[PDB]
Design an enzyme around this catalytic site. Structure first.
Site, PDB file in Angstrom:
ATOM      1  N   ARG A  59       1.253   1.754  15.169  1.00  0.00           N
ATOM      2  CA  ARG A  59       1.034   1.397  13.755  1.00  0.00           C
ATOM      3  C   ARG A  59       1.415   0.229  13.324  1.00  0.00           C
ATOM      4  O   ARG A  59       1.934  -0.695  14.053  1.00  0.00           O
ATOM      5  CB  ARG A  59       1.786   2.635  12.828  1.00  0.00           C
ATOM      6  CG  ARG A  59       1.446   3.814  13.039  1.00  0.00           C
ATOM      7  CD  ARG A  59       2.560   4.875  12.403  1.00  0.00           C
ATOM      8  NE  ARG A  59       2.795   4.387  11.087  1.00  0.00           N
ATOM      9  CZ  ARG A  59       3.607   5.164  10.326  1.00  0.00           C
ATOM     10  NH1 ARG A  59       4.151   6.397  10.361  1.00  0.00           N
ATOM     11  NH2 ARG A  59       3.999   4.450   9.074  1.00  0.00           N
ATOM     12  N   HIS A  82       0.819  -1.280   0.088  1.00  0.00           N
ATOM     13  CA  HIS A  82      -0.129  -0.081   0.000  1.00  0.00           C
ATOM     14  C   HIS A  82       0.825   1.324  -0.056  1.00  0.00           C
ATOM     15  O   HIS A  82       0.905   2.393  -1.060  1.00  0.00           O
ATOM     16  CB  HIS A  82      -0.926  -0.087   1.255  1.00  0.00           C
ATOM     17  CG  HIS A  82      -1.921   1.171   1.211  1.00  0.00           C
ATOM     18  ND1 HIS A  82      -2.763   1.541   0.210  1.00  0.00           N
ATOM     19  CD2 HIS A  82      -2.031   2.044   2.234  1.00  0.00           C
ATOM     20  CE1 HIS A  82      -3.315   2.515   0.761  1.00  0.00           C
ATOM     21  NE2 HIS A  82      -3.001   2.850   1.793  1.00  0.00           N
TER      22      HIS A  82
END
Ligand SMILES: CCCCCCCCCCCCCCCCCC(=O)OC[C@H](COP(=O)([O-])OCC(O)COP(=O)([O-])OC[C@@H](COC(=O)CCCCCCCCCCCCCCCCC)OC(=O)CCCCCCCCCCCCCCCCC)OC(=O)CCCCCCCCCCCCCCCCC
Ligand SMILES: CCCCCCCCCCCCCCCCCC(=O)OC[C@H](COP(=O)([O-])OCC(O)COP(=O)([O-])OC[C@@H](COC(=O)CCCCCCCCCCCCCCCCC)OC(=O)CCCCCCCCCCCCCCCCC)OC(=O)CCCCCCCCCCCCCCCCC
Ligand SMILES: CCCCCCCCCCCCCCCCCC(=O)OC[C@H](COP(=O)([O-])OCC(O)COP(=O)([O-])OC[C@@H](COC(=O)CCCCCCCCCCCCCCCCC)OC(=O)CCCCCCCCCCCCCCCCC)OC(=O)CCCCCCCCCCCCCCCCC
Ligand SMILES: CCCCCCCCCCCCCCCCCC(=O)OC[C@H](COP(=O)([O-])OCC(O)COP(=O)([O-])OC[C@@H](COC(=O)CCCCCCCCCCCCCCCCC)OC(=O)CCCCCCCCCCCCCCCCC)OC(=O)CCCCCCCCCCCCCCCCC
Ligand code: HEA
Ligand code: HEA
Ligand SMILES: CCCCCCCC/C=C/CCCCCCCC(=O)OC[C@H](COP(=O)(O)OCCN)OC(=O)CCCCCCC/C=C/CCCCCCCC
Ligand SMILES: CCCCCCCC/C=C\CCCCCCCC(=O)OC[C@H](COP(=O)(O)OCCN)OC(=O)CCCCCCC/C=C\CCCCCCCC
Ligand SMILES: [O-][O-]
Ligand SMILES: [Cu+2]
Ligand SMILES: [K+]
Ligand SMILES: [Zn+2]
Ligand SMILES: [Zn+2]
Lengths: 107, 459, 186, 99, 121, 90, 180, 62, 91
Positions: free
Chosen positions: B428, B60
């Site tokens: 994250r 991504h």
């Protein structure tokens, strides 16, 4: 900074008492998607597109001069959609100065 | 022909077309991430296939940065209008322009093929060693893609720099925006190549730079010495577009043109010397931390000047002109959105605040607001402005207030909650999380599915 | 800024002047093909970039940023105990690097660190002086500041004598409370 | 009402604007020149004169901060003293302690 | 104050009302708005005011709605978004009655201050 | 010139500003020297700035200090409000 | 009025999906046999032979346009002599109704107005100064706080106990001094 | 010039359609994300587990 | 809904013959959009989202009632002691 052209009072004096500001419409007209005829072929649809260019339009003033479609950048000066070869003749950016030479004049 | 064409305007169209295609893969990966994060548990990825999630987030990031936004804002709009803005017949290097787009496509095929054939593991888009060098062959393939992409970026930068030699008019602000990004690429890419070669040496040539007695923090310095200049190589073309749109649509001459230009130059120099704000938690020396924190906060000054110069462009414009055009709305939305992203950037710039907010979803939301919202909208706004010149049709975008409103609302539903969970805190690059963070994660997930649905209405 | 090419431009002497800039501006220029045109383009650029008031603000910012940058680089090389350019000490084991150990303590106590550490009481409500005392002596003993940090610290009173709870939150009163319970030494 | 009209007429007279000190080098309009433009010109925003702008803007500032004070003193309440902190018995075992 | 103290060569309207006129409008229909404030069919030109007679620089203002609905229209004849209303009617009123303007502004600010302070506190 | 509108510099110091190119160079040099000096004269100086018995007490410090000293507020403010952990349960 | 009704006649609704019959009913892929249309397909699109297989840029159908005298055909202007002067009448584009369809009537009025420029040089210069130096002040207001908090983290403290923490895949090892 | 879907939507006032569309899209998103978890009942959300966490918080003064 | 004819502050300026042109109306019509039911639904829709945006939907409350009564009992019986108004909140 730019604040418009300078004006001398003498240039604001009318030659008639009825002079007012000319009311000419600078809206070019009503437009939409360019509408091609079915009968027209690829060549004739190209001619149609070339005849619908807003940047080829202008407004004629009372004295016969025309104020053209103008843009800050030359991106709006090519045909829409952009053709393969655009600026064959080099676009001329006109600069102004006060210099002059005698050869240009005649007495 | 199709592949042989050297026309600079055709190649510009190719860049936009390829960015949308590759973008589909990018958005799909984003949907996978948000679906997974909807609750706690496993939703669409098995616990035995957690390596796939690590690969999803890695790809991504890499694809959206190097294969979508960069090819779109630095390859697409630039290759189409720059030679026109420069009142020149065509781009200086025709054959180089052709190979650049072909190179981008070939590197994309390598990456996606590596998904299908190689074992799926991930190490982030920042490819930190030693994790990157102890992985499988998919990491080798990704490295080849980046190096190949680097070739295309540098040759394209050389192409734009040559416009200075041929420009027949005035260097407009937008032209200045591309030239400075080109300079940033010429100076940053060679350093990236070197560190990438060292990653390869450790992966493939039995080198020992990233094993004990070799400093792994070395990679982070050289990587981020390119990393942060990259984020400005991705934003500066967007700034150039915003300037043109506001001036044209409001019929107002750019105010402080020279300050705009000198603000872009300043951002570049400063952006080339602040990279270590990405390395605050490693344990750098106190004076280094203070230098980088100080210089990082300085970047706000030139960036702030540009924002206020844009505002006065929209102020005072004629009321009779219709202001609901999608291009104008997007340009205005950029100012509103970029300020949010930048301010949060200044917050994270304070290192002590950063200790709490490093490797948390606050950082995610920060760079999404600038890129996923600001940069995307800027590219859309630029393409929309050039709809007549480009000539594309079969879409309902030019005047679509529903699309703009729905996009703005839903994009904020995705990333505003990610600022909250940054003080919760949710790290994250994770897929599982504590049950007390579900609410905010769920809200953002509802936002992601909704945004995708709005992308279908344009057709 | 003159508008006639006949009227000369004033130049100082030195390495950054109007004359110095004219000599080098058109070195790589294909557009300055004759004196009249060259001068017109030169004055056009000078008018646009050097007679623009806001442009001078950026000149200040680049100078300030670069000056800090050059100095921080130089300071590391010249004073940081961990940066080695000479090799004498790097050809010896760690216990024998006396010349490099001499940089350690002077580098550990920069002026601004001594000047700004007392102002931690503008960021900490409870025991802002928790780390003030240290019996070793590598650093100075710390005394809390008497005033808030100038700027955006409106949440705290301008001076700490104005605050009612300041004295009761000190590490000394907290130590008294906990020592009365036998809870802890500090 | 008499005082109302008095102060209204007193404010009005003082606020009537004086001609602007132009910060731009414009010509003097020729003498005897009337209206030349029309109402279809792009609208020019109607701006308050400096004195009036200060008066209303100042009334707004005095209003918001007096409103803040009203909320603080009437609508909101002050914290009562914290409850006494008495010694309380902690739980005998952590719920997760192995038996 | 552009017409009042700055520029004396633009037509100066008369204030019909310091409040907007509420009217129902239909898409696909063209409306003509009075720019002089002397029409007796406000907010529209009546055929007898200055705008209708093209007198003294006054002309009718063309307007057309995109969708059907109820729209506010300018009564002060100076709103920036004329013919539509954007609040300029109140602004122009404050210029004409500065004492009243202060009263309303104080009251509005007082309410805004109380509510925002009460909720945040 | 520091924090100076250069329009003012052009007006009040016309002869010093005549050469605008040279003027720009001085702007850069002056601020370069300021940044360099800050590092090596404000931050670097070793074993300095630790005289905490010499904390500057401005005229405003004394105005507010004397005001509270005159009343009992200064004594009350400095008094330790609590030096016990637990209240006594009746 | 409804302007669409004016040019409704020109827009005849279509019969084929995507405007082409099945290739079986008519082969649009083949080159047209009509004289003068050898470069076009039957449906009017350019033939692959003209554009790809025998593209002139590749050396096919070499035909130099310029003549011996270095000239190419150029169409002259519409010249009209009058009043002892030679005039050129410019070509005016056709009515936008012909090209776009809507009837050019009831056009809203947009008057000529020169560019909307910001005035008062002195005022503008001060604003630009503020646009730059108001942010600079804020940064300076953060600078001192930043230094202090950085100094606070890096403070030599009299620590009395040490806990060593090692991070391994995927667990945390802790080493602590044992009581004597 | 537009398909039925756009002709229908673009006919209505923007502030009639927009608010309804915003809610509709959000509702649909939640519905889509709930289809895969119909009847899923993790044990950690039961009352017994909810009480045990409260006990842990009391002991740890969380 | 056959709206009324509001003359306004100056009734003489609304005393002419409107003919086909619309007549001025009270301001309640503008807020209700002439009592359009869809705009009322849209208005109710606007409130519904904004409530979700700031405080949550609050439409799940009837469904969550039993599970909010179990959470409250657990917090009181086994959770850390709450004092004063703090006892109002359960997490
Ligand atoms: C024993 C052995 C001993 C040793 C032996 C050693 C031997 C050594 C040999 C060394 C040399 C070998 C290589 C030789 C190459 C020759 C090149 C050459 O000279 O060609 C001239 C030749 C000229 O042809 P021609 O004979 O004149 O006639 C051509 C036709 O008339 C057609 O005319 P045209 O050219 O106008 O038409 C082209 C065009 C026509 O257009 C269309 O088809 C329709 C319009 C486009 C539709 C939309 C496409 C999507 C949008 C793309 C936007 C970006 C485009 C960028 C530009 C194109 C880049 C390809 O379509 C295409 O062909 C490709 C279109 C783009 C495809 C990719 C789009 C993205 C898809 C992504 C999907 C997945 C996600 O070039 C070509 O036309 C074809 C070149 C083909 C190159 C293919 C390379 C592919 C590489 C892929 C990756 C490889 C790794 C992984 C593969 C995995 C496979 C499983
Ligand atoms: C008790 C009541 C006291 C009332 C005193 C009223 C004084 C007053 O208004 O005098 C005006 C009065 C003019 O009276 P007038 O008869 O209307 O004459 C006007 C003439 O047409 C021509 O007059 P002129 O040619 O002499 O020029 C005057 C005009 C010339 O105007 C200009 O040139 C423009 C001036 C404003 C420029 C502002 C630029 C800001 C740029 C910002 C850039 C950065 C933005 C981004 C920042 C980012 C940060 C992160 O001055 C103004 O427009 C001044 C406007 C007010 C400026 C206020 C500045 C500070 C803020 C105050 C707010 C209100 C506080 C109320 C407190 C109440 C108690 C709580 O002036 C004088 O008598 C002498 C001057
Ligand atoms: C008396 C009434 C006021 C009472 C209160 C007064 C309080 C004291 C203020 C100072 C003294 C005022 C004195 C005024 C006297 C009049 C002077 C004058 O010339 O009068 C005529 C003059 C107008 O005359 P005119 O030009 O001839 O034409 C008449 C028209 O009405 C033309 O009118 P206009 O164009 O001037 O209309 C005003 C309009 C003009 O402005 C606009 O319309 C601009 C609107 C742009 C919106 C763009 C979209 C934003 C969406 C963002 C979504 C983000 C989501 C994701 C966030 C992620 C975060 C992690 O203002 C607004 O709409 C307010 C915008 C305020 C800023 C909005 C942003 C708030 C942010 C809050 C914090 C957020 C934190 C998180 C985010 C991240 C932080 C780093 O009247 C005024 O100047 C009126 C000003 C009224 C201001 C009201 C402000 C209310 C809103 C407060 C903020 C919202 C939260 C509140 C709780
Ligand atoms: C939920 C259900 C739907 C609710 C819809 C609410 C919409 C609110 C926003 C509308 C747009 C706002 C705007 O920028 O208007 C520009 C507009 C400028 O001219 P315009 O030509 O009328 O607007 C064209 C827009 O494109 C207008 O946009 P459009 O092209 O979509 O046309 C819609 C049209 C028709 O829309 C309507 O009829 C909206 C009626 C809303 C009623 C709400 C009821 C409660 C719902 C919950 O809207 C207007 O006429 C604008 C009215 C704005 C004021 C609304 C009432 C505020 C409270 C009084 O500004 C105003 O008229 C409002 C300025 C107000 C003063 C601001 C400063 C105050 C500072 C002191 C405090
Ligand atoms: C184009 C994308 C982009 C842009 C423009 C920026 C801009 C900025 N970024 Fe960046 N950033 C990223 C993309 C971007 N960033 C990404 C992708 C990461 C994460 C990479 C990873 O870790 O994997 C990141 C990470 C990142 C971090 C790391 C945090 C952490 O790792 O924990 C930090 C902290 O220093 C930072 C700071 C900044 C700053 C200070 C700016 C400044 O440019 C902001 C300047 C703008 C403003 C300040 C607002 C406008 C100016 C004004 C309104 C003037 C008034 C304001 C003031 C006076 C303050 N960024
Ligand atoms: C510019 C690059 C970019 C873009 C557009 C996006 C868009 C989005 N990203 Fe982003 N994202 C990154 C770059 C980007 N992201 C990076 C670099 C990371 C960190 C990687 C890492 O952690 O290693 C990241 C990480 C990241 C994560 C963290 C996963 C994790 O590591 O734990 C998540 C999910 O929370 C996420 C979600 C989204 C969503 C939901 C969208 C969007 O879908 C939101 C909706 C917007 C759209 C759908 C429009 C997008 C359209 C286009 C991009 C095409 C434009 C083309 C033209 C205009 C021609 N992203
Ligand atoms: C041409 C004729 C022949 C010349 C032959 C030269 C051969 C050797 C060249 C070596 C490289 C150049 C540097 C030479 C340095 C000589 C003196 C020396 O030894 O310096 C040592 C000293 C520190 O030594 P240590 O005691 O080990 O460390 C103590 C704790 N810090 O290091 C230095 O000063 C040299 C290294 C830095 C060189 C550059 C100056 C530093 C600042 C660089 C700033 C860069 C940013 C831009 C500046 C622009 C201009 C202002
Ligand atoms: C006008 C501006 C000056 C106003 C007066 C300033 C002044 O005198 O401040 C004094 C005051 C000290 O006073 P007291 O604490 O009361 O007494 C000392 C007790 N030991 O000083 C301060 O507050 C600190 C001032 C610090 C200025 C710092 C300037 C910048 C320094 C470098 C920053 C970092 C640069 C980048 C990294 C470099 C790494 C080497
Ligand atoms: O990265 O900022
Ligand atoms: Cu960075
Ligand atoms: K999950
Ligand atoms: Zn009228
Ligand atoms: Zn009005």
């Amino acid at each position: 900074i730019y604040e418009g052209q300078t004006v001398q009072e003498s240039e604001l004096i009318p030659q008639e008492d009825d002079w007012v500001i000319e009311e000419t419409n600078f809206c070019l007209g009503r437009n939409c998607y360019v509408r091609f005829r079915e009968e027209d072929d690829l060549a004739r649809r190209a001619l149609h597109q070339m005849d619908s260019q807003l940047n080829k339009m202008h407004t004629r003033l009372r004295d016969g001069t025309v104020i053209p479609y103008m843009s800050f950048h030359p991106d709006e000066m090519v045909d829409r959609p952009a053709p393969i070869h655009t600026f064959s003749e080099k676009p001329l950016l006109k600069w102004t100065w006060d210099e002059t030479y005698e050869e240009a004049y005649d007495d | 022909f199709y592949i042989l064409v050297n026309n600079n305007k055709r190649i510009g169209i190719y860049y936009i077309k390829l960015s949308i295609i590759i973008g589909i893969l990018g958005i799909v990966l984003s949907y996978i991430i948000r679906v997974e994060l909807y609750n706690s548990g496993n939703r669409i990825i098995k616990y035995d296939n957690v390596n796939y999630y690590n690969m999803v987030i890695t790809l991504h990031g890499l694809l959206m940065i190097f294969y979508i936004i960069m090819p779109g804002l630095y390859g697409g709009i630039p290759l189409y209008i720059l030679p026109i803005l420069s009142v020149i017949t065509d781009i200086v290097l025709p054959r180089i322009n052709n190979i650049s787009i072909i190179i981008v496509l070939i590197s994309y095929i390598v990456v996606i093929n590596s998904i299908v054939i190689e074992y799926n593991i991930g190490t982030g888009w920042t490819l930190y060693p030693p994790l990157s060098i102890i992985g499988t062959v998919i990491v080798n393939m990704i490295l080849y893609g980046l190096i190949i992409i680097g070739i295309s970026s540098i040759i394209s930068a050389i192409n734009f720099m040559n416009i200075l030699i041929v420009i027949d008019g005035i260097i407009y602000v937008y032209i200045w925006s591309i030239i400075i990004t080109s300079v940033l690429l010429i100076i940053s890419l060679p350093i990236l190549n070197g560190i990438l070669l060292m990653i390869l040496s450790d992966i493939y040539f039995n080198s020992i730079y990233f094993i004990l007695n070799g400093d792994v923090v070395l990679y982070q310095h050289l990587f981020w010495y390119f990393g942060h200049p990259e984020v400005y190589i991705l934003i500066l073309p967007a700034f150039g577009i915003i300037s043109i749109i506001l001036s044209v649509l409001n019929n107002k001459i750019i105010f402080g043109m020279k300050s705009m230009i000198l603000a872009i130059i300043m951002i570049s120099i400063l952006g080339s010397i602040v990279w270590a704000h990405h390395i605050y938690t490693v344990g750098l020396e106190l004076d280094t931390k203070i230098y980088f924190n100080n210089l990082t906060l300085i970047i706000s000054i030139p960036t702030g000047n540009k924002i206020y110069n844009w505002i006065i462009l929209y102020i005072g414009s004629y009321n009779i002109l219709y202001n609901g055009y999608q291009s104008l709305i997007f340009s205005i939305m950029f100012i509103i959105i970029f300020i949010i992203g930048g301010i949060t950037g200044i917050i994270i710039s304070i290192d002590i605040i950063d200790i709490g907010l490093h490797d948390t979803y606050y950082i995610v939301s920060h760079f999404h607001y600038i890129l996923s919202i600001g940069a995307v909208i800027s590219l859309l706004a630029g393409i929309l402005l050039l709809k007549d010149i480009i000539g594309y049709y079969n879409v309902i975008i030019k005047i679509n207030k529903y699309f703009g409103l729905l996009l703005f609302i839903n994009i904020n539903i995705i990333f505003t909650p990610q600022f909250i969970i940054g003080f919760n805190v949710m790290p994250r690059r994770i897929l599982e999380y504590s049950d007390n963070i579900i609410v905010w994660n769920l809200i953002s997930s509802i936002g992601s599915i909704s945004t995708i649905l709005i992308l279908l209405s344009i057709f | 800024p003159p508008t006639r090419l006949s009227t000369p431009l004033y130049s100082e002497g030195g390495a950054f002047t109007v004359n110095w800039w004219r000599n080098r501006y058109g070195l790589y220029s294909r557009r300055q093909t004759d004196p009249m045109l060259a001068e017109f383009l030169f004055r056009q650029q000078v008018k646009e970039w050097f007679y623009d008031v806001p442009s001078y603000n950026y000149a200040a910012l680049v100078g300030l940023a670069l000056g800090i940058l050059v100095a921080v680089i130089w300071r590391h090389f010249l004073f940081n105990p961990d940066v080695y350019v000479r090799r004498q000490e790097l050809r010896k084991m760690w216990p024998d690097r006396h010349r490099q150990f001499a940089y350690a303590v002077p580098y550990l106590n920069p002026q601004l660190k001594n000047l700004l550490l007392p102002y931690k009481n503008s960021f900490i409500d409870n025991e802002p002086d928790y780390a003030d005392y240290n019996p070793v002596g590598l650093r100075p003993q710390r005394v809390m500041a008497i005033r808030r940090i100038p700027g955006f610290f409106w949440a705290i009173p301008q001076y700490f004598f104005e605050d009612p709870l300041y004295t009761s939150c000190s590490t000394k009163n907290m130590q008294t409370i906990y020592k009365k319970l036998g809870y802890s030494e500090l | 009402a008499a005082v109302r009209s008095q102060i209204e007429a007193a404010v009005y007279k003082w606020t009537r604007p004086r001609p602007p000190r132009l910060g731009v080098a414009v010509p003097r309009s020729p003498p005897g020149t009337g209206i030349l433009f029309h109402t279809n010109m792009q609208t020019i925003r109607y701006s308050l004169s400096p004195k009036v702008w200060v008066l209303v803007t100042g009334a707004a500032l005095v209003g918001v901060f007096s409103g803040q004070r009203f909320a603080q003193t009437v609508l909101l309440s002050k914290n009562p003293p914290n409850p006494p902190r008495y010694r309380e018995k902690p739980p005998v075992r952590h719920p997760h302690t192995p038996d | 104050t552009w017409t009042e103290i700055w520029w004396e060569h633009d037509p100066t309207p008369k204030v019909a009302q310091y409040r907007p006129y509420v009217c129902t409008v239909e898409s696909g229909k063209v409306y003509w708005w009075c720019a002089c404030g002397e029409s007796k069919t406000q907010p529209w030109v009546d055929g007898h005011c200055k705008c209708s007679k093209r007198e003294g620089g006054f002309r009718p203002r063309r307007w057309e709605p995109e969708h059907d609905g109820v729209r506010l229209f300018c009564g002060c004849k100076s709103c920036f978004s004329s013919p539509t209303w954007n609040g300029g009617c109140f602004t122009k009123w404050m210029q004409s009655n500065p004492a009243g303007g202060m009263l309303y502004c104080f009251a509005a600010a007082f309410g805004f201050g109380t509510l925002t302070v009460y909720r945040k506190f | 010139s520091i924090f100076t509108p250069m329009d003012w510099m052009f007006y009040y110091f016309p002869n010093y500003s005549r050469d605008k190119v040279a003027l720009m160079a001085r702007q850069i040099k002056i601020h370069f020297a300021i940044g360099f000096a800050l590092v090596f004269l404000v931050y670097h100086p070793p074993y300095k700035g630790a005289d905490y018995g010499n904390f500057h007490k401005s005229p405003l410090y004394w105005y507010k200090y004397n005001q509270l000293e005159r009343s009992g507020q200064l004594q009350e403010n400095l008094r330790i409000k609590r030096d016990w952990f637990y209240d006594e349960d009746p | 009025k409804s302007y669409y009704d004016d040019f409704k006649d020109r827009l005849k609704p279509g019969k084929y999906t995507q405007g082409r019959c099945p290739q079986s009913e008519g082969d649009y892929r083949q080159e047209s046999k009509t004289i003068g249309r050898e470069h076009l397909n039957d449906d009017g699109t350019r033939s692959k032979r003209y554009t790809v297989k025998e593209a002139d840029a590749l050396g096919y159908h070499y035909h130099p346009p310029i003549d011996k005298k270095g000239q190419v055909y150029v169409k002259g202007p519409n010249t009209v002599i009058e009043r002892g002067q030679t005039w050129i009448k410019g070509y005016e584009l056709p009515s936008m109704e012909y090209t776009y369809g809507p009837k050019q009537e009831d056009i809203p009025f947009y008057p000529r107005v020169k560019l909307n420029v910001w005035g008062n040089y002195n005022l503008v210069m001060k604003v630009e100064f503020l646009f730059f130096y108001l942010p600079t002040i804020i940064v300076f207001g953060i600078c001192i706080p930043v230094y202090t908090i950085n100094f606070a983290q890096e403070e030599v403290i009299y620590t009395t106990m040490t806990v060593k923490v090692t991070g391994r895949q995927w667990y945390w090892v802790y080493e602590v001094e044992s009581p004597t | 010039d537009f398909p039925w879907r756009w002709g229908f939507v673009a006919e209505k006032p923007f502030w009639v359609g927009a608010p309804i569309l915003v809610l509709g899209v959000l509702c649909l998103g939640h519905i889509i994300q709930t289809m895969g978890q119909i009847g899923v009942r993790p044990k950690r959300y039961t009352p017994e587990w909810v009480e045990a966490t409260k006990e842990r918080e009391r002991a740890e003064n969380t | 809904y056959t709206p009324s004819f509001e003359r306004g502050l100056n009734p003489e300026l609304t005393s002419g013959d409107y003919g086909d042109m619309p007549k001025p109306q009270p301001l309640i019509d503008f807020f209700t959009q002439n009592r359009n039911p869809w705009f009322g639904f849209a208005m109710f829709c606007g409130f519904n989202f904004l409530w979700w945006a700031f405080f949550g939907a609050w439409q799940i409350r009837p469904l969550w009632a039993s599970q909010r009564k179990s959470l409250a009992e657990a917090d009181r019986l086994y959770g850390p002691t709450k004092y004063g108004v703090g006892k109002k909140y359960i997490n």
